[PDB]
Design a protein around this ligand. Structure first.
Ligand SMILES: C[C@@H](Oc1cc(-n2cnc3ccc(OC4CCN(C)CC4)cc32)sc1C(N)=O)c1ccccc1C(F)(F)F
Ligand SMILES: [Cl-]
Ligand SMILES: [Cl-]
Ligand SMILES: [Cl-]
Length: 258
């Protein structure tokens, strides 16, 4: 694996420590992206846990998880490139901001696609990747892929909008993930998270109460019902992955297609 095997098309995003760039694989013209990380200032310990993290990326292979392709070490410029799938539709955060700014709600069909495909991504993770809009990506074929938010971080002030009731009291619980999914799907429909506040303490008060507005009336009672169940205060009242996928709303066409 050599950087020379690829040509950079342009930069998609830039963080404090590295960049994400759209690239083209020379051999066959495949369009991909890479994360460019300067590890020059890292300690041996930091570099070791970087290797271990990257190894985990190689472990997951699933149609609804952003696919890892390659890793390239350029020891000359002390840069590491992590090559992954290009998702032409971008991230969900951008989609929500767009709807919010342009005052246009998303189709129920699109929300069902996200629910179906992220629930399957979650199911694979649980077999053995934060559930947040900025970490969910869309390809050019109506597919939805869960990213590695560890990549965004490697490139406190934030309000933890999606924190579950049990998590703010200790997590380590698969049903906590269902709560976060509920928040995400809620925000996709409402163009705002179900619980808002200016501080974490205020937010926590609202979460504990467990009340929120119905998603907009353009969305079916069936869709509102399942999202509302995911936002139950009791983890054991939230539906499992299996129970979500059994919902009559979810059909073959909402799943991934090559
Ligand atoms: C840090 C980065 O993490 C990413 C990026 C991934 N990815 C794969 N194909 C993509 C196409 C677009 C895209 O972001 C866009 C471009 C600019 N818009 C204004 C917003 C949408 C990202 C794409 S996968 C992946 C991961 N960690 O698995 C990232 C994450 C969220 C949003 C942007 C970015 C980036 F801009 F840095 F790329
Ligand atoms: Cl609106
Ligand atoms: Cl609709
Ligand atoms: Cl697919």
């Amino acid at each position: 694996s050599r950087a020379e095997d690829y040509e950079v098309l342009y930069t998609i995003g830039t963080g404090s420590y590295g960049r994400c760039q759209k690239i083209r694989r020379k051999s066959d013209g495949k369009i991909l992206v890479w994360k460019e990380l300067d590890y020059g200032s890292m300690t041996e310990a930091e570099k070791q846990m970087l290797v271990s993290e990257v190894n985990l990326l190689r472990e997951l292979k699933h149609p609804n998880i952003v696919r890892y392709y390659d890793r390239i070490i350029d020891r000359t410029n002390t840069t590491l490139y992590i090559v992954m799938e290009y998702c032409e539709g971008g991230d969900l955060a951008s989609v929500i901001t767009k709807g919010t700014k342009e005052r246009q709600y998303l189709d129920e069909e699109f929300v069902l696609r996200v629910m179906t495909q992220l629930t399957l991504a979650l199911k694979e993770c649980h077999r053995r990747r934060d559930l947040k809009p900025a970490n969910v990506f869309l390809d050019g074929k109506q597919n939805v892929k869960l990213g590695d938010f560890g990549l965004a971080r490697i490139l406190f002030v934030g309000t933890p909008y999606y924190m579950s009731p049990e998590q703010m009291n200790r997590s380590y619980n698969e049903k906590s993930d269902i709560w976060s999914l509920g928040c995400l799907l809620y925000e996709l429909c409402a163009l705002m998270p179900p619980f808002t506040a200016f501080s974490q303490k205020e937010l926590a008060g609202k979460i504990r109460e467990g009340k929120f507005r119905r998603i907009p009336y353009r969305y079916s009672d069936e869709l509102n019902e399942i999202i509302t169940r995911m936002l139950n205060l009791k983890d054991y009242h939230r539906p499992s992955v299996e129970e979500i996928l059994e919902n009559p709303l979810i059909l073959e066409h909402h799943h991934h297609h090559h």
